[PDB]
């Protein structure tokens, strides 16, 4: 008759990194870094907006002839752009407050374009048809932004302009206009007659006077003079006013809308599907028990916190083999595949039979302490977390987390190594002379010990009746 002690073994192939060793295989472990990949995205159903395609945000909101006219979905929480977006502002210039506008249009609940100033009626004292250019071609001919009108002098005069609109739609309206900056004084006169011109766009929430500059910029897109693009939001009841004597690209179509909070922009070439999945990577599970991912530094919506690591996996079980104290990788040089009940257990051998059995007092106390320690790590992560603080904390927190996982993995395997050494010392202190030590984690029972006698050693109550 013989009694032996050993560890649990299983067919798991999970590898963890420790302080001393790396790529160590273990029986049980929890991951700390998830990388599935975008199916498509495809998130919250329709929800991607009017896939921008060959245009960008500026060209879409201004109405570049190359972009597809509405169309345009009624609602979207986020916007997708392509890196190959060649078509933006056809006429050269720069879009003023572009980053702000991008974040405003990101998430929207209701969106409607309406003709704020009809071309035919609103402009009786100015020529609106001549507002075309070679920089904005449509079908091999001069065209212009579908949402704007480039007012030119009507013959030999450009009268003072004064147009206004009252927001009666019951929701904030996005208005966009442009200010032209010609090349030479001859072009300035040929477009708006007057020489010293001015533009003023007033409202309750916005007010600014533009004095256009007439200068020869280096040639771009076959236009020497450039054009800056401006915008504002008119609250319901507020009245926008356009006072100008030239060099003003008045609006044609405004956008009545109801914004939503948060969101951002995605610049990628991936295509679209419909699958009702939230921000967390496909298939919308999402369903990511881990608070870490390695996909993109910034992601849109209620997602986990990004960490650029090769792998993070916290260890829970012991080394899988189908030490410091001397147990694991020591006297006991192998694990038990047959034993499945618990991490630590015994193995009896007598005339009645043979079988494996786990010590639940040591196993349950370990599970309670391990689970408590695993939850303490997820707590220390979530509870405590411009380029030197946004990007600086990321690289240092990643290294701080890597160090902590490495540190906590070594403390885990040593805690198992100690629990087993304590289980052997528990048996050794009971039978001093009744059985000798084999050296392979086993004991040679000199006297007879049946199934009921073997249970007395498991119970922790051993008697000394015989040689």
């Amino acid at each position, epitope marked *: 008759d013989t009694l032996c002690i050993g560890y649990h073994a299983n067919n798991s192939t999970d590898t963890v990194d420790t302080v001393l060793e790396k790529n160590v295989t273990v029986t049980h472990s929890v991951n700390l870094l998830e990388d599935k990949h975008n199916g498509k995205l495809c998130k919250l159903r329709g929800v991607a907006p009017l896939h921008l395609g060959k245009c960008n945000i500026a060209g879409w909101i201004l109405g570049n002839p190359e972009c597809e006219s509405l169309s345009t979905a009624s609602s979207w929480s986020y916007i997708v752009e392509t890196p190959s977006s060649d078509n933006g502002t056809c006429y050269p210039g720069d879009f003023i407050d572009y980053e702000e506008l991008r974040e405003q249009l990101s998430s929207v609940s209701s969106f409607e374009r309406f003709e704020i100033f009809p071309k035919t009626s609103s402009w009786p004292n100015h020529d609106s048809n001549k507002g075309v250019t070679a920089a904005c071609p449509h079908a091999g001919a001069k065209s212009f932004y579908k949402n704007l009108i480039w007012l030119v002098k009507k013959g030999n005069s450009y009268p003072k302009l004064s147009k206004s609109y009252i927001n009666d739609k019951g929701k904030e309206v996005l208005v966009l206009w442009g200010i032209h900056h010609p090349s030479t004084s001859a072009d300035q006169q040929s477009l708006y007659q007057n020489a010293d011109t001015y533009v003023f766009v007033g409202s309750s929430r916005y007010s600014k006077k533009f004095k256009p500059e007439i200068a020869i910029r280096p040639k771009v897109r076959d236009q020497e003079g450039r054009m800056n693009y401006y915008w504002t939001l008119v609250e319901p009841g507020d009245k926008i006013t356009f006072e100008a004597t030239g060099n003003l690209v008045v609006p044609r179509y405004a956008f009545a809308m109801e914004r939503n909070a948060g969101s951002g922009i995605i610049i990628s070439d991936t295509p679209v599907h419909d699958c009702n999945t939230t921000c967390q990577t496909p298939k919308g599970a*999402i369903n990511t*028990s881990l608070p870490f991912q390695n996909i993109h530094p910034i992601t849109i919506g209620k997602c*986990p916190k990004y960490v650029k690591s090769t792998k993070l996996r916290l260890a829970t079980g012991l080394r899988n083999i189908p030490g410091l104290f001397g147990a694991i990788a020591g006297f006991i040089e192998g694990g038990w595949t047959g034993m499945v009940d618990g991490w630590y257990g015994y193995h009896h051998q007598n005339e009645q039979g043979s079988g494996y059995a786990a010590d639940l007092k040591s196993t349950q106390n370990a*599970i309670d302490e391990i689970t408590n320690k695993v939850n303490s790590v997820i707590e220390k992560m979530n509870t405590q977390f411009n380029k030197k603080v946004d990007d600086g904390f990321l690289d240092i927190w990643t290294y701080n987390a890597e160090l902590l996982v490495l540190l906590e993995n070594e403390r885990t395997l040593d805690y198992h190594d100690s629990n087993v050494k304590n289980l052997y010392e528990k048996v050794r202190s009971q039978l001093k002379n009744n059985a000798k030590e084999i050296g392979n984690g086993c004991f040679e029972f000199y006297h007879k010990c049946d199934n009921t006698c073997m249970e007395s050693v498991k119970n922790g109550t051993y008697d000394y009746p015989k040689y």
Partner: antibody
Amino acid sequence: QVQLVQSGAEVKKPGASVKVSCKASGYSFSSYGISWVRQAPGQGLEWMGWISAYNGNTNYAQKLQGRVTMTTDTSTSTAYMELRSLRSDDTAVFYCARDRPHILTGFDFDYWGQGTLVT
Amino acid sequence: TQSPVSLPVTLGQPASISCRSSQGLVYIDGNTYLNWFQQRPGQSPRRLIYNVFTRDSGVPDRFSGSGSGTDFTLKITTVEAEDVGVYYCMQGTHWPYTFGQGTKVEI
């Protein structure tokens, strides 16, 4: 067709003990893994105990640890339940369902019992 | 801790329940939260979404349980008339399993 069956409703006065059985029947039965839960009207649910014929050492609820007791049979494939003292607030419907034979591998109530209503 | 104890809803529109715990239970290999069952009047409860997100066999796709860390929810798109009864949260990791007050659904 895979479902378990248990004893019918019973009734006992305050003081006398009571016993309830839970047979496994057809079909796909783990050799091991059985739990018990109670539900009184007006309250909610609370765990009573657990047992495995592997035999992993059973587990009881500290509050009811003194009184409850668990037993099982492999041949008949049936689990039994026992209580000592009874009282007015002790009335509840006792349910029985399967659990992980391993216990450390996981937990799942794939199939539930009928509900032994004891007063 | 469950909330709310009384949940009044109507047909067509969805619903949601909330459960929170004392510790961010996980276990080994992400067992996390036990799944949720629906107990109809005078009937035993049936399994729904085991392992937090994995749905149960023989259950429509209308139900959907989601959550991460010690609060959780269970959403059901379009409420039918049969979706009535008492609902409870499921103890995890611990053997002192501890269930909810549960929420009584009514249409």
